[PDB]
């Protein structure tokens, strides 16, 4: 039960410009995804001030980062507001984003890639380190869906019958490039968070697998 | 798409006798589940000697233990052979087990609960620490299914559309009793494994969540 959608043309250009013209300061992808997780968490918390029951699907407010080294995947999960199917479709690629063209012109003129979050398109920085991404999301107002893109001209949206149930929120599942596997490392992850994601109102958890011996 | 099955009557008696008459040496449940995981791993590995492609669904052979403290759940996962739907139904409760009545008589006479694995029913030791269990399993020869029981007279078997895809093998998902939450602790888990599960041919991984600060 799987639909395909074409990306708005500037978004496709944006993604190409990120994958192919940007060389450094890649670690900023993690600040941007932590900022997005934090924005989603702010929104469910604010929503719950006048509708406490919204929190019941998942009472704990957190960000959690799960390196999956054998799969070469990094997951960034939040228990924020989540996105409905129509929200994944409208906001993750089909509709013109304010910022998209403006950001690409600032980049052309010499702007540091890190300014991407200030243009409201910092989601697409994930393509600095990942050649495939799934956004698995569960809004209180919809079923769990999977949005997926390999940075081509199109993305798919699919009713989620394959992943763990999230009570509420989003998993960013990044299929890292072979040159960017340092973001599977516990120490590298902690460093980038401590240096660049210093003021976050929510706990940030790191899931570590160790061998018992 | 969810079927209910009655437990064979001695199995129901066994489970009651475990929950209600046994007081100590509870930690043996972990040795038994590690032994079962190890038996499942031996079987896929042996199967693959003459059918290498069996391993392709999940090339890594491991046991992994994931404490889920906010859910009061402990999961024990293996990438062994897994069980088909008909295997969950036949082997986990509907058919008479050799050992069941014999074990219950040995227990009555004073046998230590730890002898349960020697009677071939050591699976049911999980009821020392858990009041609910899901066995989520994926055999190469079937779809993923969920078997579930709260130790009543019946269990359910359900096509799995809610949990993460396992490539191949089994997750024991234990809903721990409130008095047995020590088995959520990293140090307690390591101790019981080091003391009682010393000779295991497969890596045993422990998944730990820490806050980054
Ligand atoms: C306004 O809002 C925004 C946006 C638009 C939209 C998309 C939003 C959305 O809707 C549905 C929502 O609200 C959400 C909450 C989302 C978010 C942030 C997220 O996530 C999560 N984790 O959940 C995301 O990711 C997936 C999506 C998108 C993003 C983007 C595109 C960007 O980059 N930015 C932004 C953003 C940002 C910027 C900066 C920082 C952060 C974020 C924002 O805020 C926006 O857009
Ligand atoms: C013969 O075989 C057995 C049994 C019977 C059956 C059930 C088996 C089965 O079938 C399907 C299979 O083969 C598998 C491999 C399984 C197993 C072990 C497992 O797991 C896993 N992890 O996977 C289990 O759990 C879920 C199941 C069951 C168990 C039981 C009941 C017991 O206790 N024991 C045994 C057992 C044991 C004993 C001792 C130690 C370990 C195990 C065994 O071995 C048996 O039975
Ligand atoms: Ni690098
Ligand atoms: Ni830095
Ligand atoms: Ni279906
Ligand atoms: Ni105790
Ligand atoms: Ni002991």
Query: B119: annotated binding-site residue?
Result: yes
H/E run at residue A169: strand A169-176
Task: Give the pairing of strands A204-211 and A63-68.
Answer: parallel
**Chain-centre distance of CA B201, in angstroms?**
18
How close is the Cα of B27 to the center of ligand 7, in Å?
A: 7
Residue B211: which of A161, A194, A205 has the nearest Cβ?
A: A205
Q: How far is CA B80 from the centre of its chain?
A: 12
- Distance (Å, rounded) from C-alpha A1 to C-alpha B111? 55
State how far the Cα of A34 lies from the Cα of B68, in Å rounded to an integer. Answer: 23
Atom index in ligand 2 nearest the CA of residue B91 equals: 7
CB neighbour burial string for B188-206, b if at least 16 within 10 angstroms, e if fewer = ebbebbeeebeebebebbb
Considering only CB atoms, A60 lies closest to which of B70, B203, B205, namely B70
Half-sphere exposure of B129 (CA within 13 A, CB side): 25
The answer to whether the CB of B26 falls within 8 A of the CB of B43 is no
Query: Strand B145-149 relative to strand A154-159: parallel, antiparallel, unpaired?
Result: unpaired
Place of tokens 């061998």: A211
In terms of Cα–Cα distance, which of B164, B148, B142 is closest to B2? Answer: B148
The full set of domains in chain A, from first to last, is: 1-213 (3.30.565.10)
Atom 17, ligand 1: which residue's CA is nearest? A36
Q: Which of B39, B82, B138 to mutate to test the pocket of ligand 2 (most atoms within 8 A of CB)?
A: B39
Spatial distance between the Cα atoms of A145 and A161, rounded to a whole number of angstroms: 8
Ligand 1, CB within 6 Å, residue ranges: A 35-37, 39-40, 43, 78, 80-81, 83, 87, 91, 117, 120-123, 135, 170
Among A163, A198, A212, pick the best mutation site for testing chain B contact (most B Cβ within 10 A).
Answer: A212
- Let me know: does B129 contact B177? Beta carbons within 8 Å: yes
Is A207 in contact with B207 (Cβ distance < 8 A)?
Answer: yes
Q: Which ligand is nearest to the CA of B197?
A: 7
Tell me the nearest-neighbour CA distance from B108 into chain A, angstroms: 36
CA distance A131 to A39: 24
For residue B2, the CA-to-ligand 5 centroid distance in Å is 12
Cα separation of B186 and B209, whole Å?
A: 10
Burial zone of B97 (CB within 10 Å; 0-12 exposed, 13-18 middle, 19+ buried): buried
* Closest C-alpha to B210, from A203, A184, A74, A21: A203
Residue B95 and residue B6: Cα distance in Å, rounded? 10
State the distance from the centre of ligand 6 to the C-alpha of A51, rounded, in angstroms.
41
Q: Identify the nearest ligand to the CA of B161 by its number.
A: 5
Known binding-site residues of A for ATP equal 32, 36, 78, 83, 91, 97-99, 118-123, 170
The size of chain A, in residues, is 213
Q: What is the resolution of this structure in A?
A: 2.2
- 8 Å CB contact of A162 and B165: yes
Q: The tokens 């997750």 sit on which residue?
A: B171
Sign of the dihedral defined by the CA atoms of residues A114, A119, A123, A126, in that order: negative
Q: How far is CA A67 from CA A17, B147, B162, B171, B184, in A?
A: 27, 29, 22, 20, 21
DSSP B155: E
Q: Which token pair is A36?
A: 């997005």
Asked whether the beta carbons of residue B204 and residue A211 sit closer than 8 angstroms, the reply is yes
Q: Give the containing element (helix H, strand E) for B12.
A: helix B9-21
Question: Using CA atoms, how far apart are residues A148 and A4, in angstroms rounded to an integer?
Answer: 10
CA atoms of B191 and B177, how far apart (whole Å): 20
| Residue bearing the CA closest to ligand 2, atom 36 | B120
DSSP result, B36-70: HHHHHHHHHHHHHTT-GGGGGG-----EEEEEEGG
Chain A residues whose CB is inside 8 A of the B211 CB are 203-206
d(CA A173, nearest CA chain B) in Å: 13
Q: Are A57 and A198 in contact (CB under 8 A)?
A: no
As a whole number of angstroms, the distance between CA B165 and CA B148 comes to 17
Interatomic CA distance for residues B33 and B170, integer angstroms: 11
Q: Which residues of A touch B (CB under 8 A)?
A: 60, 64-65, 70, 161-165, 189-190, 193-194, 203-212
CB A146 within 8 A of CB A134: yes
Residues with CB under 5 A from ligand 7 (ion): B 195
């Amino acid at each position: 039960a799987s639909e395909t959608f074409e990306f708005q043309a500037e978004i496709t250009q944006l993604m190409s410009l990120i994958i192919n013209t940007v060389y450094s300061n890649k670690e900023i992808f993690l600040r941007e995804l932590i900022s997005n997780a934090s924005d989603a968490l702010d929104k469910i918390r604010y929503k719950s001030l006048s509708d406490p029951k919204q929190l019941e699907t998942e009472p704990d407010l957190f960000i959690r980062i799960t390196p999956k080294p054998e799969q070469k995947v990094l997951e960034i999960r939040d228990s924020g507001i989540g996105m409905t199917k129509a929200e994944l479709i409208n906001n993750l690629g089909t509709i013109a984003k304010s910022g998209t063209k403006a950001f690409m012109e600032a980049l052309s003129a010499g702007a540091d890639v890190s300014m991407i979050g200030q243009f409201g398109v910092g989601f697409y920085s994930l393509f600095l380190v990942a050649d495939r991404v799934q956004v698995i999301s569960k809004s209180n107002d919809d079923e769990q869906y999977i949005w997926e893109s390999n940075a081509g001209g199109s993305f798919t949206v699919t009713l989620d019958e394959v992943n763990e149930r999230i009570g509420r929120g989003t998993i960013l599942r990044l299929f890292l490039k072979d040159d960017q596997l340092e973001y599977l490392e516990e120490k590298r992850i902690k460093e980038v968070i401590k240096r660049h994601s210093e003021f976050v109102a929510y706990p940030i958890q790191l899931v570590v697998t160790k061998e018992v011996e």
